[PDB]
Amino acid sequence: PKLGSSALIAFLSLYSSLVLNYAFFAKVVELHPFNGTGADIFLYTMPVVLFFLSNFVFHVIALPFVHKVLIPLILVISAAVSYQEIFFNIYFNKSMLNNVLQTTAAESARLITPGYVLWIVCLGVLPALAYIAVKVKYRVWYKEFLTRLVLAAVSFLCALGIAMLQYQDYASFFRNNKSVTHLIVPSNFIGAGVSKYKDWKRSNIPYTQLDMAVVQNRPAGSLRRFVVLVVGETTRAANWGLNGYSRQTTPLLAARGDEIVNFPQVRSCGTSTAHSLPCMFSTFDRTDYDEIKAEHQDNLLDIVQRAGVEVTWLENDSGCKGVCGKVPNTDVTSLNLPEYCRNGECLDNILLTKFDEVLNKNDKDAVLILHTIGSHGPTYYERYTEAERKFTPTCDTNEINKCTRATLVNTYDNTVLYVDQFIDKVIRKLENRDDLESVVHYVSDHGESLGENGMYLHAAPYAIAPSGQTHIPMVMWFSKAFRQHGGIDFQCLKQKAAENEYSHDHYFSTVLGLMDISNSQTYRKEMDILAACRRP
Ligand SMILES: CCCCCCCCCCCCO[C@@H]1O[C@H](CO)[C@@H](O[C@H]2O[C@H](CO)[C@@H](O)[C@H](O)[C@H]2O)[C@H](O)[C@H]1O
Ligand SMILES: CCCCCCCCO[C@@H]1[C@@H](O)[C@H](O)[C@@H](CO)O[C@H]1O
């Protein structure tokens, strides 16, 4: 092989800080543009700072002879991360690790493209091999030890000096742009990794149950009450026909006119599925939401099931993120019906094949959840059939960043056309059931980025997330028997829907109010969207 001293680590640091991390320096030049006023030293020196800082932590990490394993891993992962940071504009924070950790083979394989593989292999696996090849000439364990600790420390001070010489620039820039740090590799996922490790240990707590005395309190002589909750995926409000978008992407629901209540101002709990799902079914408002406490207490379905309601969850995304484990549920995607399914994913209309079994399961009030794959990208083109391919040209690849933005928007507007007909078909299975007080409720889990300022997919840090990812659609439909006997004032409801802001925080108590449930301590009347319009 080749023989280096270290040295080997200055090269490693030259690479990591100067080759990868393009996304990081790209973001700061965007946030802090050149102009010539000599304040650009803040930009020029900045790679130098990161070099020194990388030299520092790599002297501490590159220990013999675990480093021959640990460094290639870091180089290979930095490549895998920097690629999507550079082209998709993602951040690698703790939540992004929860994505990676909660994913599936079908779901993540769609992310692979030849350029991605080529990137990883040329910027990750290769430098890894080059590194592993090098035989390192250690000095005497005392002479070697001293040489490491002095370099590691002068590096830090060199970085601290260069920054301290420019303290107000650093202080300003990073107090305003606190998340830009989740762009730096590898502090990135290491930081997220220990932060998740800390969460792992702090997770030994017991299981709290909530609302143990809940019961239904439906009047005597009441029709069965059947509620369907359609959980969307990735569909955003800005491309939703009912919300006034240039294209009627919801023509079937627009056609139903007034019987469909549309909410033009609703925001999500999170901007990823792993975050939004568990949160919206938990008691925690977005700003109180704790991942760990939520995982270890009863959620909405647990409580609603305790009250005697029949809860079924049919799944067609990558899983229910832990929300459905204690209620009857089905992985509909695994039926692999060639009419709907290819490559381990399915068109949402497959869910409708199992709908009637649930509807005729028994004769007590029910909550049925249809968890859909919706507008899930990057393979948006799989989210609809030819019948809904109304806007063209389309982006028929997972390489969504090489499509033109208009071509991508087209493809994504076709996914909504499929969302729209899915909801419509659910309503059709119910609207003629005169013996049934039925409600169909739809909301998405989060929106999506469609290439704006260079950002694709979703999962952005909420605090800096764009409207596209947080502003989501929501509609409600009520069957004829519900409108006769459900006690709701429908014109009141239309007005509230038009005038008020809502969010996922209204989900929990809205669903509980639809089941007429007594003795509930978790129910909050002021978070039930219909309470204000319920009579008497
Ligand atoms: C293990 C140490 C960290 C290195 C792990 C390797 C990561 C390499 C870069 C991957 C980061 C980008 O890849 C990321 O993958 C996950 C799941 O596939 C996607 O996330 C997808 O699944 C998760 C979980 O079901 C959902 O919360 C999310 O809504 C959905 O987008 C991200 O949208 C995508 O951006
Ligand atoms: C090699 C350059 C190091 C720069 C370090 C920047 C500050 C540390 O940034 C960490 C992140 O790395 C970490 O992912 C999250 C986890 O919650 O918390 C931040 O404080």
Would you list the domain boundaries of the chain? 1-205, 206-536
φ, ψ at 126 (rounded to 5°): -70, -55
Residue 355, CB half-sphere, CA atoms under 13 Å: how many?
Answer: 23
Chain mean position to CA 229: 19
For residue 380, which of 233, 272, 271, 229 has the smallest C-alpha distance?
233
Burial of 524 (0-12, 13-18, 19+ CB in 10 A): middle
Distinct helix (H) and strand (E) counts, the chain: 21, 17
The residue whose CA is least distant from atom 13 of ligand 2 is 191
- CA distances 467 to 234, 295, 425, Å, are 13, 28, 29
Peptide bond into 536 cis (omega under 30): yes
Ligand 1 within 6 A of CB of 5:
no
Atom of ligand 2 nearest to the CA of 93: 14
Technique used to solve these coordinates: X-ray
Contacts of 163 (CB under 8 A, 6+ apart): 49, 170
Q: Which ligand is nearest to the CA of 46?
A: 2
Q: Enter the resolution in angstroms.
A: 2.8
What tokens were used for 241?
């026909």
φ, ψ at 495 (rounded to 5°): -60, -45
Distance from the alpha carbon of residue 174 to the mean position of ligand 1, in angstroms = 26
For residue 330, which of 307, 347, 349, 311 has the smallest C-alpha distance?
311
User: How is residue 478 annotated by DSSP?
Assistant: E
Strands (E), 81-148: 135-136
Atom of ligand 2 nearest to the CA of 92: 14
Burial of 171 (0-12, 13-18, 19+ CB in 10 A): exposed
Ligand 2 within 6 A of CB of 193:
no
Ligand 2 within 6 A of CB of 187:
yes
Residue 445, CB half-sphere, CA atoms under 13 Å: how many?
Answer: 27
- Alpha-carbon span 369 to 440, nearest angstrom: 10
- Alpha-carbon span 154 to 312, nearest angstrom: 62
The listed CATH number (3.30.70.1230, 3.40.720.10, 1.20.120.140, 2.40.160.10) that belongs to domain 206-536: 3.40.720.10
Sign of the Cα torsion 294, 298, 302, 307 reads negative
Contacts of 402 (CB under 8 A, 6+ apart): none
Q: Which ligand is nearest to the CA of 188?
A: 2
Q: Containing H/E element for 510? A: helix 507-513
Q: Where are the alpha helices (DSSP H) in 165-237?
A: 167-176, 187-201
User: How is residue 533 annotated by DSSP?
Assistant: G
Cβ–Cβ < 8 Å for 311, 327? yes
Tally the residues of the chain. Answer: 536
